[PDB]
Design a protein around this nucleic acid. Structure first.
Ligand code: K
Ligand code: K
Ligand code: K
Ligand code: K
Ligand code: K
Ligand code: K
Ligand code: K
Ligand code: K
Ligand code: K
Ligand code: K
Ligand code: K
Ligand code: K
Ligand code: K
Ligand code: K
Ligand code: K
Ligand code: K
Ligand code: K
Ligand code: K
Ligand code: K
Ligand code: K
Ligand code: K
Ligand code: K
Ligand code: K
Ligand code: K
Ligand code: K
Ligand code: K
Ligand code: K
Ligand code: K
Ligand code: K
Ligand code: K
Ligand code: MG
Ligand code: MG
Ligand code: MG
Ligand code: MG
Ligand code: MG
Ligand code: MG
Ligand code: MG
Ligand code: MG
Ligand code: MG
Ligand code: MG
Ligand code: MG
Ligand code: MG
Ligand code: MG
Ligand code: MG
Ligand code: MG
Ligand code: MG
Ligand code: MG
Ligand code: MG
Ligand code: MG
Ligand code: MG
Ligand code: MG
Ligand code: MG
Ligand code: MG
Ligand code: MG
Ligand code: MG
Ligand code: MG
Ligand code: MG
Ligand code: MG
Ligand code: MG
Ligand code: MG
Ligand code: MG
Ligand code: MG
Ligand code: MG
Ligand code: MG
Ligand code: MG
Ligand code: MG
Ligand code: MG
Ligand code: MG
Ligand code: MG
Ligand code: MG
Ligand code: MG
Ligand code: MG
Ligand code: MG
Ligand code: MG
Ligand code: MG
Ligand code: MG
Ligand code: MG
Ligand code: MG
Ligand code: MG
Lengths: 118, 146, 64, 205
RNA sequence: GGUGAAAUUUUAGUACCUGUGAAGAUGCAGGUUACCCGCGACAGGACGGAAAGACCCCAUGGAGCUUUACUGUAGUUUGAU
RNA sequence: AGGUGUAGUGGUAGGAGAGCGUUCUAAGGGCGUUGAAGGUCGAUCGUGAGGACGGCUGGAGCGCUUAGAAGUGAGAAUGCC
RNA sequence: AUAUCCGGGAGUCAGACUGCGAGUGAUAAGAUCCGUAGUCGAAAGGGAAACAGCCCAGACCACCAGCUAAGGUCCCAAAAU
RNA sequence: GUAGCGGCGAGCGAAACGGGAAGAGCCCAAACCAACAAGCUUGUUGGGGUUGUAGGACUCCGAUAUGGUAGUCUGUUAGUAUAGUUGAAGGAUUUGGAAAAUUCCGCUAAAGAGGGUGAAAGCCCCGUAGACGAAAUGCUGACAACACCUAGGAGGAUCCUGAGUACGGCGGAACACGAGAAAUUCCGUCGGAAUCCGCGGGGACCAUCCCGCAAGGCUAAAUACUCCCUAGUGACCGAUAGUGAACCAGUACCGUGAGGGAAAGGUGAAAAGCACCCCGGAAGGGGAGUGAAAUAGAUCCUGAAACCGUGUGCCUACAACAAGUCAAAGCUCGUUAAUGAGUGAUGGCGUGCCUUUUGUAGAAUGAACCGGCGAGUUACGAUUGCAUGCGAGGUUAAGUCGAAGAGACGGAGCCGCAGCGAAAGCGAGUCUGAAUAGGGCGAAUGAGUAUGUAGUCGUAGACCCGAAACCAUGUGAUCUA
């Protein structure tokens, strides 16, 4: 028999337009522009789920570096000293101690400095 | 069976492949034809046996022989097929036709000595291979050219 | 419509018992002074259609 | 095998015996499926057509010059991408019928008949007699035999009044013993066959 | 004040320099400059618009033309009947 | 039926496999003026095509299961309207 | 842990750069033409400011966890002023 | 897709036999006879006669029967087409504007096909099954009438049996057959027979044998097609589809003309199509009404998107931004309740989609946007995979009956079971060869076939769109020469 276009076409395009809500001007309005930008958004979103892991480790290291220097030590020497002392605390936890519990961070720094001397 | 519970035998029926219905099907866009050229075109392609202008194989080779207007081809019956009849049977082109052994006798029945004959028969046929004649008579039967 | 046999091929090849094709030999028409006796003797013998060529011409002889 | 015999009044008389080659074989489900599909296809009429670009009215001339107008090149107003243009491919009148090998047809018919017996859906009656055709009476016979589901009533040739009285009931399908198809049998939940109809079937098969 | 088109147009929040890159980038890199919105003007750029380059090459494309190209042929002429 | 272990899982042309959705047919089983399809909205589900469930709109038809047949899926054709 | 062999289905016959070995060239060309290996093609990620073909390295997915490669550690900008 | 034809290319491509549908045979010319008319023949008429196991004339006898028909507005009769008649069985209840929906109990059915009715009805309507009906005019079939045909056997002395014909040369054509070794048929041209002791064909030609008897005509059925008419059917369309045309369409409109050729369906169950009032010149609104509903008010069902506007929760006047993405305060909100939603200062990262390319963000191509439409299909064949049935076997085709079905019958035919050889031919072998040799192809060392389904191919427009052009009928000198 004859199968006319029906409603499938509209349904499919409406899904893309919903993904494009909040985009500027025609990019949330017109299907072709919206689909092109949703594709680019997907490309960015996948790439950025990898990049966010890089960015946060970059943030923690910088914060640990600032706290390390306040304890008479560079970031690189502190991580060497913690490794020598068998401390497995990760950079997310160290950065959190650097900001929220400075006394605990100082206790870790002292253990690292002790391990470096030995 | 039930009309609301029909099921074909496994592997008896397959789904047709539709080309040019999107890229993820693997036959989207170019529909399996690749890129340009004569074979990408609608109705494109060269005739069977065309070698792009190299002299085709058949032109390279000589024509041979002729067909004989009077050529006679015989329907072949071997001895193993005559073991199907009981001892003393009269094996005839009519009998072989009724048995369904020889539906088309062509220029006639010819008997050949492929297998071993084990029953005594009086065999009637257009022609006999010398070996077939010996086997039939060695079995204590007899042959007759019709 | 029925597929048509390639008549020129049908005049040049024969279907053998194994389903292969028996063929004559090229270079068996003239200029025999240009060929050794060994060449003439061995071109006298028939050959078969090669695998690559057979796949190209097989449809043209389906009902030969 | 053996099947209970009923009279038109509904009391069970002694059993009868059916040929085992016809009603006793193991049903071949794949063969039945093939027969069902083929028969359904054979009923198709295939009267469907569309106009391709040559059949559509008009369209001979080239709409505009090949070059220079800035428009897409067009060869006819009836080209398929045009509104009102010819249809590309699409339905063309054709038959949908094909014939299975005879042996397969026979096996299919025996399968459905042997399946009805195996499920005890084959109710054999001595006879169905009516002085005059009356639906209410046949309806009462179906009640006599405790048949409330779709039934194929298989009558011997010449039983006009039984056929007349049965046919209007929405759950009844009437055939004669010599015109019985696989689709007829598979559709029915039950088969009601007179004794002479069963004998005729066994002579046909 | 009234009336009211058009070519064009992938979406555009549409700078400069040097560089880079399909080797000449408003959009990439680095740096520099730049508050938001217009109006009247000018045309350097958007390899601006218009036309599926006409030059050039190609397609065992097309057409018109020529001749001691090939093959035919109207006409003309000569003989036989 | 699942479990363990090891290994593997970028991809154009292209080959293979398995599915989603559309209209129609058959059978079965169902839903509809106590509101069908369609439209619209929502923060919903699945590995994907896609699938539900609610509110509103709407006013008559339409799902589901199994099988069948297909004018069966569009974003590009200086495509047509 | 592949090899052949038989058969169904293809696509491909514009390649590019880089290293190395040669020719052509002026031991010019992002030149041309072979051989040989790689990458691109058909490969995202990190480095080379940007930079298909170089260096490191092959993305089934999730993580605000860890270790490294090339390359890096004064600020932009993660890490030894 | 065989035999053949064929720049032996591309391609073209039979026929007879076998199986079916349907079947049916007959009249002339001539001899000869009779009549008439004319210039012993030489015409007209009527008789006679009709062919190949040769027939007929003729001469003998012997029967005026028996059979047949593709004759006629010859009537009579029946049927049938073209109007019609008749035709079973339901009320309540719940919901609703309305019941056919629902529930409850009933009933009718030779009718449960279908349509309509205020939603979906076997029982309300039109119908349906069934029964029934024709003044008139056709059509058909019989029957009758009438007309028209229809003689057996034996004899051969003689006579007849289609001439400028057959046939031949030359030039063309048709035969599947392209001049070919080219028979058979035909056309033009020229030449040109025999005639029963004859003539033609059997694929050059001759002999023999066999089969036929040209140069005269007619003939039902089986076959092709459907502008129209009647009744229906559809895994056909459902208004961008389906006819170009559902609508006042071959219309409007374009063109000198031939010719080209559109767009355009839907209020509601019923108009009950908004009395009256109010603003306005009107248009149009606001009330009031109608209605189940008028945001169903005629541009009228539903009413998407582009596009245009109004309100406003959050943000925005130091910023260079394919515009997103990841991180993120603040503010405003509260969900399919989910480690929620909207907005978003600020920070990191980041050159669209497609096509085509060695390589494109590309300063190459394509798209203004949105919506709809728009491209590997079908038929017949080839072949392979998968599947089913049967298996050294498998299977029917046309056709007949049958629902436009299944099925039954139908074995003609096709594939397979044996190959080898150019072929005669031999045969589990065979060909080559002097060969018991060697070698080629086969067997040893078996699986096929029917159908379905899918992949691919072939013939067809063959996935869709696009040339410049070519050819063949027509229309134009109202412009211009
Ligand atoms: K392919
Ligand atoms: K050959
Ligand atoms: K030669
Ligand atoms: K470029
Ligand atoms: K300018
Ligand atoms: K020209
Ligand atoms: K909804
Ligand atoms: K299509
Ligand atoms: K378009
Ligand atoms: K190289
Ligand atoms: K590689
Ligand atoms: K054929
Ligand atoms: K050729
Ligand atoms: K007569
Ligand atoms: K009704
Ligand atoms: K009458
Ligand atoms: K000839
Ligand atoms: K003959
Ligand atoms: K003859
Ligand atoms: K409405
Ligand atoms: K707004
Ligand atoms: K950002
Ligand atoms: K350009
Ligand atoms: K041998
Ligand atoms: K030998
Ligand atoms: K099989
Ligand atoms: K197959
Ligand atoms: K086509
Ligand atoms: K095709
Ligand atoms: K004039
Ligand atoms: Mg569409
Ligand atoms: Mg299919
Ligand atoms: Mg692919
Ligand atoms: Mg695409
Ligand atoms: Mg392309
Ligand atoms: Mg190419
Ligand atoms: Mg190609
Ligand atoms: Mg050449
Ligand atoms: Mg020779
Ligand atoms: Mg040599
Ligand atoms: Mg046309
Ligand atoms: Mg334009
Ligand atoms: Mg149309
Ligand atoms: Mg550069
Ligand atoms: Mg530049
Ligand atoms: Mg940017
Ligand atoms: Mg960048
Ligand atoms: Mg330009
Ligand atoms: Mg061009
Ligand atoms: Mg991987
Ligand atoms: Mg629908
Ligand atoms: Mg389509
Ligand atoms: Mg569009
Ligand atoms: Mg180069
Ligand atoms: Mg490429
Ligand atoms: Mg890369
Ligand atoms: Mg690229
Ligand atoms: Mg740092
Ligand atoms: Mg230092
Ligand atoms: Mg009534
Ligand atoms: Mg009721
Ligand atoms: Mg010819
Ligand atoms: Mg002749
Ligand atoms: Mg002549
Ligand atoms: Mg004879
Ligand atoms: Mg006729
Ligand atoms: Mg229309
Ligand atoms: Mg519509
Ligand atoms: Mg139209
Ligand atoms: Mg409304
Ligand atoms: Mg409306
Ligand atoms: Mg500033
Ligand atoms: Mg500010
Ligand atoms: Mg280039
Ligand atoms: Mg672009
Ligand atoms: Mg630009
Ligand atoms: Mg453009
Ligand atoms: Mg004129
Ligand atoms: Mg005039």
């Amino acid at each position: 028999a004859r199968v006319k276009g029906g409603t499938v076409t509209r349904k499919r395009r409406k899904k893309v337009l919903k993904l494009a809500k909040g985009y500027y001007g025609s990019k949330h309005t017109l299907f072709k522009s919206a689909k092109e930008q949703v594709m680019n958004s997907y490309y960015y979103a996948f790439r950025d789920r990898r990049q966010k892991k890089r960015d946060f480790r970059k943030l923690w290291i910088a914060r640990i570096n600032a706290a390390a220097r306040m304890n008479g030590l560079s970031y690189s020497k502190l991580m060497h000293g913690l490794k020598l002392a068998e401390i497995d605390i990760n950079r997310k936890m160290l950065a959190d101690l650097a900001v929220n519990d400075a006394a605990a961070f100082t206790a870790l720094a002292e253990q690292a400095k002790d391990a470096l001397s030995k | 069976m039930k009309l609301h519970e029909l099921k074909p035998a496994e592997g008896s029926r397959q789904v047709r492949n539709r080309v040019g219905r999107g890229t993820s099907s693997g036959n989207g866009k170019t529909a399996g034809r690749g890129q340009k050229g004569q074979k990408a075109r609608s109705g494109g392609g060269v005739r069977l046996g065309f070698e792009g202008g190299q002299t085709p194989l058949f032109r390279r080779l000589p024509k041979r022989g002729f067909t004989n207007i009077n050529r006679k081809d015989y329907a072949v019956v071997n001895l193993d097929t005559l073991n199907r009849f009981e001892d003393g049977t009269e094996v005839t082109p009519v009998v072989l036709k009724e048995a369904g052994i020889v539906k088309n006798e062509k220029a006639g029945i010819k008997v050949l000595a492929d297998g071993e004959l084990t029953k005594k028969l009086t065999v009637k046929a257009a022609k006999f291979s010398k070996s077939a004649q010996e086997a039939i008579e060695a079995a204590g039967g007899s042959i007759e050219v019709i | 419509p029925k597929q048509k046999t390639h008549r020129g091929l049908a005049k040049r090849v024969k279907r053998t018992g194994g389903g292969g094709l028996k063929r004559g030999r090229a270079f068996t028409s003239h200029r025999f002074h240009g060929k050794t006796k060994k060449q003439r003797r061995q071109l006298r013998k028939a050959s078969m259609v090669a695998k690559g060529d057979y796949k190209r011409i097989r449809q043209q002889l389906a009902r030969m | 095998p053996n099947v209970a015999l009923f009279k038109q009044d509904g009391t069970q008389n002694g059993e009868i015996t059916l040929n085992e080659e016809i009603f006793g074989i193991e049903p071949n489900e794949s063969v039945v499926y093939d027969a069902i599909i083929m028969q359904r296809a054979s009923l198709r009429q295939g009267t469907h057509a569309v106009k391709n670009r040559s059949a559509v009215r008009g369209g001979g001339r080239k709409p505009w010059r090949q070059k220079g107008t800035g428009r897409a090149r067009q060869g006819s107003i009836r080209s398929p991408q045009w509104r009102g243009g010819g249809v590309v491919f699409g339905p063309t009148p054709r038959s949908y019928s094909y014939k299975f090998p005879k042996k397969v047809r026979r096996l299919a018919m025996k399968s459905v008949l042997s399946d009805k017996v195996a499920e005890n859906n084959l109710v054999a009656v001595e006879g169905l007699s009516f002085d005059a055709p009356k639906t209410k009476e046949f309806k009462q016979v179906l009640a006599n035999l405790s048949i409330d589901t779709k039934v194929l009533v298989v009558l011997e040739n010449g039983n006009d009044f039984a056929a007349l009285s049965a046919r209007n009931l929405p759950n009844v399908s009437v055939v004669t013993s010599d015109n019985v198809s696989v689709l007829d049998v598979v559709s029915a939940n039950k088969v009601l066959a007179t004794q002479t109809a069963l004998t005729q079937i066994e002579e046909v098969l």
